[PDB]
Design a protein around this nucleic acid. Structure first.
Ligand SMILES: Nc1ncnc2c1ncn2[C@@H]1O[C@H](COP(=O)(O)OP(=O)(O)OP(O)(O)=S)[C@@H](O)[C@H]1O
Ligand SMILES: Nc1ncnc2c1ncn2[C@@H]1O[C@H](COP(=O)(O)OP(=O)(O)OP(O)(O)=S)[C@@H](O)[C@H]1O
Ligand SMILES: Nc1ncnc2c1ncn2[C@@H]1O[C@H](COP(=O)(O)OP(=O)(O)OP(O)(O)=S)[C@@H](O)[C@H]1O
Ligand SMILES: [Mg+2]
Ligand SMILES: [Mg+2]
Ligand SMILES: [Mg+2]
Lengths: 426, 319, 327, 274, 290, 284
DNA sequence: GCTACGGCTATACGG
DNA sequence: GATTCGTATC
């Protein structure tokens, strides 16, 4: 009389739908974080939705927290719905983190933060970033272990005017946690992957064998295998798979089986645009589905830069120069359309059509990379700082003004070979 | 001095039996009503195909007498933020309402595609703790708008466009219950202009009967207009340039359609076109994009549309 | 004080019988109001077609002496965000009638320039309060509206004003102002307006101003062309003939003479040549493509500014090159 | 840096009142008020269009004012959290309202503020974190110079005088309004005309009482005008000076004398020109 | 000047104008000027209207030298006027309200011997609609009740404190000299009612008619479903009031007369919500049976 | 099921203050009704701060309780339910300009009540002007768990007068200092509301170090049984202290043994019993 | 004298 | 989506 993702829930660590390597590394990290030494303070779990990112922490705490606790068992999940009377919503998480640090000896309990505060609001987002930053840099000799399961999901289109970006596009850990936290030596980011087909089939078969009377009663036990295979091959979400299986089993008719559609990742979308999709051989259908399901990813200028930086992976880069010229020319034309959706459609349709007429069997492809634009902009900012310093020291010594363009082109190069080459002589 | 409900509201379905179209989905909803074990659902489809009416009918047939305090119909018109999800939805879900066996409260979050991200994140938490007593019933035109973590624990029932037979059946029921003189060609024209939208067909029939009386093709077409996505497809697929130019100048320009609308409809039709080569399709998309840029800059004129048609015909027929 | 008004504001129709042209829409809404029930309307069409003068006249004819407390009008000149839609419209359309007069009309002029969030929040207000409130939507661009909002709105298309309606309105304006207009000048007004009453009214006001004696003098075609700086058909035909037949030097000289003796702009001449070239034989299909593409490019360049002489030479060369595909 | 100052209220109700007024003003203006502790006196700096506040607190104010440092003329500069200083001064004046001096020291930086209260030895320790600035930044922070080319020092009526309450009301006339952002002060050979011009809301507040001290005009922000009005309430001697389209000077002075006089000056930069 | 009125007491007019504060905080107001005095009419969303009257006897130098019009109307803002009349005092500040006809600012000259403040406000064209639209019909009054100002103010403050998203009005009279008048609140806490006392000190008079304003009936309850966002617009108005009179007709229009020179009379009118739910009235009636 | 009336000014004030503080501890206040006393308690989201208020039968003028209702929990028989704190705190507040003549709270889950009263608490407020206000806040029946700490903690014992403590707490602010360092010595007793500082990457200053302190005496201590440098939170401590003086009928007792065992608090009234438990730090 | 209240203010949120 | 490496298992 309830949903099948409950009741038929994992009871031990073996029942958890997770790969062996993932389980072993998560357990190693947890055991390292429960030692008296505090090499790692927080464990930043991340991954797609419903990838056993929550059901494994409780099972680990069932056989880890009591062992290392003192004598004189579960988690301390943060409730984001508790509206305290004399407490602002920003201060709710502050109080949570300031009261959860007292669980060290005789009160040890893992701190699980899955439902993050409204990080879409800038003020509380930076307050949370500061609070977790204080946790890493805390002078406290002993702190309890802490886990932040940031479920990555593609934030859909919104009516927010600007509100910067990042958290308005994706709900990844990089859009919530800042670079200082990610690169902190005491942070361990163990990412999670979608559940493999084998474990999904195993668990679905376990559910089916645990309830077969109604399956055979509704002449579905003989058709169970195809349904299980289709469900385990269409989605990598365990909870969604169980819900779909329950919906199909409880039903009585010929309703087609449907499941949630996964969002195509950035590298995945780049590969689909460059190489294609094995499922669909029609370019128009694939492009239309890609734009309809994920338009927040194909609209960013990074994806065009991604194609520009990754189209040299087809046949390791041995394709004709004319194809590359056409691709880059059309990319420039799309850049010259001020971000219209038509330009976004054309810049991918042309690439897919070009990489279709030259598709040759038995040609190894290379690897892709993120566009090298952040490095370039950081170097440009460094050069800006250098030019500003040079012009500042220039005006302080002598009354001569020099334009930044000339500094970049002429002054910048000759300034060392003049000043430092005469410092030698002094 | 009107006091007369529109035909859209007048013959609104109150049972899960007169809802035409999507026979399998309606049968599944009937099974849910019979049993009561309603799972979380996210109904998705084109506008005006019974998405909201089906949810309301299933809520009426599940809660029954407890419909007054068993359903919380929230919508885009009402305030839907993180605060409202954390207080009103939380209290409604947390409410201990006695219900018949196998019955759960139905939080009707209609137009859930327009909800804020933080509200959906709080919905995740409230649904994780309150799903043994309450069952959320989302209703949106696009399932992708609802975040995947929410879709993880919600069953998906995507609605399809109503066929020309179910719409005809419901229209005939309305005609019989209203005693309206009809013509076969008139009903065919109503179905054609409906484009699978039952509410639009009902509105067109009501307008035709109230303004002209007898419902035939002439009276339907003298008040309702042929869909412009079809004239756009006709002009884009015209082999000869003169034919397309005439189809534009007489059926989209003098008819009173803005150039920007003509460009957007052309882009959509090209996206959803068929029997055209991929290179031709992308070249047409590029031409439509150039024309769209020219329209947006402020050069919106018939000349730009004619140039777009000329470019399309040139890339279709070569040199 | 109505005399101290622009002719586009003091000639605004006050009753449905003064809204010429849109006869089908007027008849349909009259049938609706006479039969009591009025569906949620949506008026669409080019600007200046009477999409507001019709709805305001309908509101006046429905709510006599009560056009103020029964009708709420919101336009782009005021904020129409989420808060406005969720508070003001809801409060107005959620209250009982003043004197049980009927339903509460809500006129949303220029609803195209509205955020999609507001357009989606308005739909449930429209559907949940349809018993005592009927919404009217005025928009010039249909692509700006949510498809669901279009679904829950009966669509009336305000087509460009036909020649007969504009002629009748011009006759009424002439009678009211005691003016005289030549039939050729009236046809020039028809072609200049291209389905827009406000353009005709403004040009007539400017012509009356341009006349030394607005009483004993007749507004001729020359006045109608001089007051707006528009090219006469004769000069456009001469320019087209010079470009199509004479050599490059004489064509350029004729173009310069036409654009200098009267001050005519180049874009107006381009539009006139385009219009005169539509009803041409042009057997070869490539000539049409060349003409349309090159003239559109030149018009786009003119819209961004530049050298008028170079643009005119480009026009001449483009037309000559396009008509070389003829032979 | 053995900075150890001692403040008391009962033995002198004027110097402590001046110190409290300065602390309240610097707290109201902005955060992180600079404290330039010299050997001769003390200056509570408040430097960000935005106005600047400068005061001269004589060493006679503090019973054991000792500032010893290796820098020039024993100059110690230390930016401090004025909010915490405001809180501790509020606590101390609450203690006085309810005979222990407010002894302060520089513990390590940190201000070892402490004072006892009797309801009963209730020692209220109020350590406040404080930074220490260098000479280069201290030399960078300097009091602005006002050229007296035509600066007219309109002598404001004393508070104790009969006209004092009327002039205070005249100053606060524009405060009660809500849509007031910029105030166009005008001074003529003398009377004060508080004139505020908007799109439709006109204002011609004028003072008719006798005043002591061509025309002078300046436009200043109403945010600083409330601060000036609050300052005018405490100090008996008050001088308001107007620079023609250049600046505005609200010169307050507390003549302790013999004994060094204390003054506080707030320079207002015309938010917009004439 | 066509109009010129001088007053010595500013706190009274200040409170009278501040009674309009709960309405649009920064918007336009209409000021009718006639021989009787000057008035302030404010309407929000065409659902609620408030009218404040200041009689001639309140002032001391009322002239009204205009002759071409029986009444003179002008549209100005509210915040600036309230701030000007909030001048308080130290010596009486004699206001010099003036208006020199069409195209002239509504000048407020304040003289305090030492201070000669003069304030001018430009006039906006018109509200441009029939203001007299919320007036109740004096033939179909459903009920007429009089309640003291303090009790109603306390009840409205209590409703505001507990949220009170929507409000109901319950009025019923019995032949056994037992009259019941109370307000129901649909808030986050559910349906909460506030029963006013039947004593004549609180409720001086209660007469439930039958849509004719003449026949008094017993056992019939008049339900008025009013949105509280408009019902709280007169919360502070009753705070300075002595007696408050309630009038609601069958047209769903509430009329509240507030009275504290013959004092100040505040005549407000409110529209009634459509009451979509049929069971809402039924459940209110069932709740009122206890 | 039960009925309890509060016909007094001070009793109503202390009831409102206790409800407000329990709301400032957790979003929903949990109330357990018994045949001898009314117990309202709240617990933090981290299971670290727990406060229980026990209004005895003598607190209510008419405290009836009939557990013969058809949830119910048996150990004596007591009925427990959970109600929203933010909804109960806006009911018990004293209106300004008027006075609460009678404040009674009751519920009847029997078959007599209709669906409108089903799972709806009844609280009735009567003004001095005879104005009667009715509210129906919703509730959900739950089960009560008595945390056995007071029976086990009764380790050093400290009894101090709450006047100076309350003054120091109201002088403190919950946004600048979030710690309480209660240090008691044989010579003097000191309470410091300090704040640990957090250093950034390049030895920056991420968190300030406000160190408000207060030392009074040892003789003034009513009972200083040393038989200590304990540290705990501040925000809940101030509210629990301010609970008491709201009734004009004031001291408080301290219980703590080890840095791991939570510190126990208890201050009593003629009809109100107050208890607070806070988990401290074990950083020796 | 203390109160209960009017005005001030620090401020979490708003758009 | 493609590559390289890596166990685990039938
Ligand atoms: N064999 C199984 N393996 C994993 N989860 C299972 C299994 N059987 C049932 N479940 C349920 O499926 C759900 C999966 O939970 P998790 O994926 O761990 O949570 P999650 O990853 O945080 O999901 P999100 O990110 O909140 S959408 C839980 O409710 C489990 O109780
Ligand atoms: N299958 C159907 N059978 C009968 N009437 C229908 C059907 N689908 C829609 N309608 C009519 O459509 C009108 C309202 O339909 P809705 O369910 O509100 O539209 P919708 O499917 O929810 O699309 P949106 O997104 O809400 S615009 C009523 O007049 C219904 O009678
Ligand atoms: N049918 C008509 N007959 C006579 N005058 C008309 C007619 N339609 C429009 N006009 C005139 O044109 C003016 C502008 O028309 P409106 O109805 O106010 O605006 P509109 O036609 O809706 O165009 P937009 O989209 O609002 S800019 C009116 O005030 C009339 O003077
Ligand atoms: Mg989880
Ligand atoms: Mg719907
Ligand atoms: Mg218009």
């Amino acid at each position: 009389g309830e949903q099948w993702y409950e009741k038929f829930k994992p009871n031990c660590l073996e029942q958890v739908a997770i790969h062996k390597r993932k389980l072993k590394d998560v357990q190693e990290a947890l055991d390292a974080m429960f030692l008296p030494n505090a090499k790692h303070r927080i464990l930043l779990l991340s991954g797609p939705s419903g990838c056993s990112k929550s059901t494994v922490i409780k099972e680990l705490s069932k056989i880890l927290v009591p062992k290392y606790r003192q004598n004189s068992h579960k988690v301390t999940e943060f409730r984001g719905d508790c509206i305290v009377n004399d407490l602002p919503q920003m201060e709710s998480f502050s109080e949570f983190l300031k009261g959860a640090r007292y669980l060290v000896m005789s009160n040890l309990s893992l701190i699980l933060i899955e439902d993050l505060p409204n990080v879409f609001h800038i003020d509380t987002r930076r307050r949370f970033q500061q609070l977790i930053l204080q946790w890493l840099y805390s002078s406290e000799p002993l702190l309890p272990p802490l886990v932040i399961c940031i479920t990555e999901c593609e934030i859909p289109e919104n009516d927010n005017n600007y509100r910067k970006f990042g958290i308005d596009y994706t709900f990844s850990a990089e859009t919530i946690m800042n670079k200082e936290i990610l690169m902190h030596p005491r942070l361990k980011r163990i990412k999670f992957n979608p559940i493999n087909s084998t474990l999904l089939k195993k668990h679905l078969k376990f559910i089916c064998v645990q309830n077969m009377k109604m399956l055979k009663e509704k002449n579905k036990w003989n058709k169970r295998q195809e349904v299980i295979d289709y469900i385990a091959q269409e989605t990598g979400d365990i909870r969604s798979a169980i819900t779909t299986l329950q919906f199909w089993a409880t039903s009585s008719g010929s309703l087609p089986i449907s499941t949630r559609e996964s969002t195509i990742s950035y590298f995945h979308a780049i590969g689909k645009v460059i190489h294609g999709s094995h499922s669909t051989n029609n370019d128009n259908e694939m492009i239309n589905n890609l734009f309809e399901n994920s338009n927040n990813l194909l609209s960013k200028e990074d994806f065009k830069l991604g194609i520009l930086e990754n189209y040299n992976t087809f046949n390791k880069g041995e394709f004709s120069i004319s194809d590359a010229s056409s691709i880059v020319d059309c990319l420039s034309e799309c850049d010259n359309m001020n971000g219209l959706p038509e330009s976004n459609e054309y810049g991918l349709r042309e690439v897919r059509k070009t990489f279709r007429n030259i598709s040759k069997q038995g040609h190894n492809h290379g690897t892709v990379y993120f566009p090298r634009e952040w490095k370039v902009r950081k170097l440009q900012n460094s050069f800006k700082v250098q030019a500003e310093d040079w012009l500042n020291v220039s005006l302080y010594k002598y009354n001569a003004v020099h334009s930044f363009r000339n500094i970049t082109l002429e002054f910048g190069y000759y300034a060392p070979l003049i000043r430092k080459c005469q410092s030698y002589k002094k | 001095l009107s006091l007369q409900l529109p035909w859209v509201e007048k013959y609104r379905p109150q049972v899960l039996s007169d809802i035409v179209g999507n026979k399998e989905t309606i049968d599944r909803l009937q099974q849910i009503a019979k049993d009561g074990n309603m799972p979380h659902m996210i109904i998705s489809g084109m506008p005006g195909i019974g998405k909201t009416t089906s949810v309301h009918c299933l809520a009426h047939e599940l809660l029954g007498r407890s419909y007054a305090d068993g359903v919380l119909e929230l919508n885009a018109s009402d305030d839907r933020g993180i605060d409202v999800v954390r207080n009103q939805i939380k209290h409604f879900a947390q409410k201990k309402l006695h219900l018949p066996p196998g019955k759960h409260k139905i939080v009707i979050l209609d137009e859930a595609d327009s909800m804020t991200a933080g509200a959906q994140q709080a919905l995740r938490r409230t649904m994780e703790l309150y799903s043994n007593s309450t069952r959320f019933a989302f209703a949106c035109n696009q399932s992708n708008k609802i975040i995947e973590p929410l879709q993880s624990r919600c069953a998906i029932l995507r609605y399809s466009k109503l066929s020309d037979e179910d719409v005809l059946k419901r229209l005939l029921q309305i005609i019989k219950l209203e005693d309206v003189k009809y013509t076969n060609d008139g009903l065919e024209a109503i179905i054609f202009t409906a484009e699978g939208d039952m509410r639009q067909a009902i509105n067109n029939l009501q307008s035709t009967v109230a303004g002209h009386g007898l419902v035939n093709a002439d009276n339907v077409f003298k008040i309702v207009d042929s869909p412009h996505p079809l004239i756009v497809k006709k002009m884009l697929l015209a082999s000869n340039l003169e034919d397309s130019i005439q189809i534009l100048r007489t059926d989209l320009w003098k008819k009173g359609y803005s150039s920007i609308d003509i460009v957007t409809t052309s882009f959509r039709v090209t996206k959803n076109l068929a029997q055209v080569k991929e290179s031709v399709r992308l070249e047409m998309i590029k031409e439509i994009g150039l024309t769209h840029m020219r329209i947006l800059e402020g050069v919106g004129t018939y000349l730009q549309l004619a140039s777009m048609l000329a470019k399309i015909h040139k890339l279709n027929n070569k040199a | 004080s109505k005399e101290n008004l622009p002719w586009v504001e003091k000639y605004r129709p006050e009753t449905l019988d003064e809204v010429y042209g849109q006869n089908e829409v007027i008849t349909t809404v009259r049938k609706f109001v006479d039969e009591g029930k009025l569906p949620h309307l949506l008026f669409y069409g080019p600007p200046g077609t009477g999409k507001t003068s019709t709805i305001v006249a309908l509101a006046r004819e429905i709510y006599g002496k009560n056009y103020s407390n029964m009708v709420l009008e919101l336009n782009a000149s005021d904020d129409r965000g989420i808060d406005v839609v969720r508070n003001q419209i809801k409060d107005f359309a959620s209250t009982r009638q003043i004197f049980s007069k009927g339903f509460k009309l809500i006129i949303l002029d220029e609803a195209d320039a509205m955020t999609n969030a507001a357009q989606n929040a308005l739909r449930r207000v429209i559907e949940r309060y349809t018993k005592n409130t009927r919404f009217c939507v005025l928009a010039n661009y249909a692509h700006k509206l949510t498809p669901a909002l279009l679904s829950r709105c009966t669509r009336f298309r305000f087509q460009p004003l036909p020649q007969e309606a504009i002629e009748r309105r011009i006759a009424n304006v002439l009678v009211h102002e005691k003016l005289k207009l030549s039939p050729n000048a009236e046809k020039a007004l028809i072609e200049l307006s291209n389905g827009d009453m406000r353009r005709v009214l403004n040009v007539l006001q400017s012509c009356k101003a341009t006349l030394d004696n607005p009483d004993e003098d007749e507004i001729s075609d020359d006045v109608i062309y001089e007051c707006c700086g528009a090219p006469r058909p004769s000069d456009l035909k001469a320019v087209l003939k010079s470009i199509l037949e004479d050599d490059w030097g004489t064509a350029h000289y004729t173009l310069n003479k036409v654009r200098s003796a009267k001050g005519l702009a180049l874009i107006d001449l381009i539009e006139g040549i385009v219009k005169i070239l539509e009803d041409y034989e042009l057997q070869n299909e490539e000539t049409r493509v060349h003409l349309l593409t090159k003239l559109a490019d030149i018009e786009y360049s003119i819209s961004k500014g530049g050298n008028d002489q170079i643009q005119g030479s480009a026009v001449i060369g483009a037309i000559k090159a396009s008509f070389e595909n003829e032979t | 840096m053995k900075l150890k100052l001692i403040v008391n209220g009962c033995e002198a109700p004027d110097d402590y009142k001046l110190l409290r007024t300065t602390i309240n003003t610097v707290a109201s203006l902005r955060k992180t008020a600079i404290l330039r502790f010299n050997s001769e006196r003390l200056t509570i700096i408040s430097t960000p269009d935005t106005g600047q506040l400068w005061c001269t607190i004589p060493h006679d104010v503090f019973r054991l004012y000792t500032v010893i440092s290796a820098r020039e003329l024993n100059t110690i500069t230390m930016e401090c959290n004025c909010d915490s200083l405001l809180s501790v001064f509020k606590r101390y004046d609450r203690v006085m309202n309810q005979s222990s001096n407010m002894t302060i020291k520089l513990q390590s930086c940190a201000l070892g503020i402490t004072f006892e209260e009797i309801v009963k030895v209730i020692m209220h320790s109020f350590k406040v974190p404080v930074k220490l600035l260098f000479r280069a930044q201290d030399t960078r922070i300097q009091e602005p110079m006002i050229n007296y080319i035509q600066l007219m020092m309109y002598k404001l009526p004393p508070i104790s005088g009969e006209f004092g309450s009327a002039f205070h009301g005249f100053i606060r006339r524009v405060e009660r309004y809500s849509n007031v952002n910029h105030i166009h002060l005008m001074g003529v050979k003398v009377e004060l005309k508080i004139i505020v011009n908007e799109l439709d809301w006109h204002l011609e507040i004028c003072w008719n009482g006798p005043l002591d001290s061509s025309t002078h005009e300046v436009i200043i922000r109403c945010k600083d005008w409330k601060v000036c009005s609050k300052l005018y309430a405490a100090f008996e001697e008050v001088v308001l000076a107007i620079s023609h389209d250049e600046s505005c000077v609200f010169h307050c002075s507390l003549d302790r004398g013999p004994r060094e006089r204390g003054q506080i000056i707030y320079y207002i930069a015309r938010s917009k020109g004439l | 000047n066509k109009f010129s009125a001088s007053t010595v007491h500013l706190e009274h007019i200040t409170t009278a104008l501040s009674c309009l504060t709960p309405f649009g905080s920064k918007d336009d107001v209409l000021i009718f000027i006639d021989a009787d005095g000057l008035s302030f009419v404010r309407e929000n969303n065409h659902v609620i209207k408030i009218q404040l009257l200041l009689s001639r006897e309140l002032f001391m130098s009322y002239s009204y030298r205009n002759e071409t019009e029986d009444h003179m109307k002008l549209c100005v803002k509210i915040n600036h006027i309230l701030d000007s009349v909030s001048v308080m005092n130290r010596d009486i500040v004699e206001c010099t309200l003036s208006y020199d006809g069409h195209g002239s600012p509504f000048v407020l000259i304040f003289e305090d011997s030492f201070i000669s403040e003069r304030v001018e406000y430009s006039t906006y064209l018109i509200k441009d609609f029939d203001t007299n639209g919320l007036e109740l019909d004096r033939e179909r009054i459903s009920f007429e009740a009089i309640i003291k100002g303090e009790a109603l103010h306390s009840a409205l403050k209590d409703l505001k404190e507990i949220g009170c998203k929507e409000c109901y009005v319950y009025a019923k009279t019995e032949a056994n000299d037992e009259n019941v008048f109370a307000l129901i609140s649909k808030s986050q806490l559910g349906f909460s009612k506030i029963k006013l006392p039947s004593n004549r000190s609180i409720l001086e008079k209660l007469q439930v008619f039958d849509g004719d304003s003449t026949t008094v009936i017993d056992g019939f309850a008049v339900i008025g479903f009013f949105d509280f966002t408009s019902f709280d617009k007169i919360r502070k108005s009753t705070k300075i009031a002595s007696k408050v009179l309630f009038r609601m007709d069958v047209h769903g229009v509430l009329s509240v007369n507030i009275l504290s020179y013959p004092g100040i009379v505040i005549e407000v009118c409110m529209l009634e919500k459509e009451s979509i739910d049929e069971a809402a009235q039924t459940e209110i009636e069932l709740l009122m049976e206890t | 099921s039960f009925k309890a009336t509060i016909t007094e000014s001070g009793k109503q004030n202390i009831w409102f203050r206790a409800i407000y503080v329990l709301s400032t501890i957790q979003d929903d206040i949990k109330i357990t009704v018994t045949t001898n006393e009314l117990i309202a308690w709240s617990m933090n989201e981290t299971d670290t701060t727990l406060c229980q208020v026990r209004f005895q039968k003598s607190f209510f003028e008419e405290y009836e309780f009939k557990p013969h209702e058809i949830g119910v929990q048996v150990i004596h028989k007591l009925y427990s339910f959970r109600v929203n704190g933010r909804h109960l705190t806006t009911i018990s507040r004293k209106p300004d300009g008027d006075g609460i003549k009678s404040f009674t709270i009751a519920v009847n889950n029997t078959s007599t009540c209709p669906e409108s009263l089903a799972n709806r608490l009844i609280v009735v407020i009567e003004m001095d002007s005879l104005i009667v206000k009715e509210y129906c806040p919703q509730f959900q029946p739950i089960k009560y768990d008595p945390i056995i700490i007071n029976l086990k903690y009764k380790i050093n014992y400290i009894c101090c007068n709450s006047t100076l403590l309350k003054n120091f707490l109201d002088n403190c602010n919950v946004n600048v200092t979030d710690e309480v360092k209660l240090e008691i010595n044989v010579h003097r007793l000191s309470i410091t509301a300090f704040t640990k500082a957090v250093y950034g990457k390049n030895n920056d200053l991420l968190r300030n170090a406000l160190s408000m302190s207060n030392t009074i005496s040892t003789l003034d201590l009513e009972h200083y049984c040393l038989f200590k440098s304990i540290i705990f939170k501040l925000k809940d401590f101030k509210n629990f202290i301010t609970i008491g003086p709201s009734w004009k009928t004031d001291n408080i007792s301290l219980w703590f043994c080890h840095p791991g065992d939570p510190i126990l608090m208890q201050m009593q009234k003629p009809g109100v019993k107050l208890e607070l438990v806070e988990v401290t730090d074990s950083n020796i």
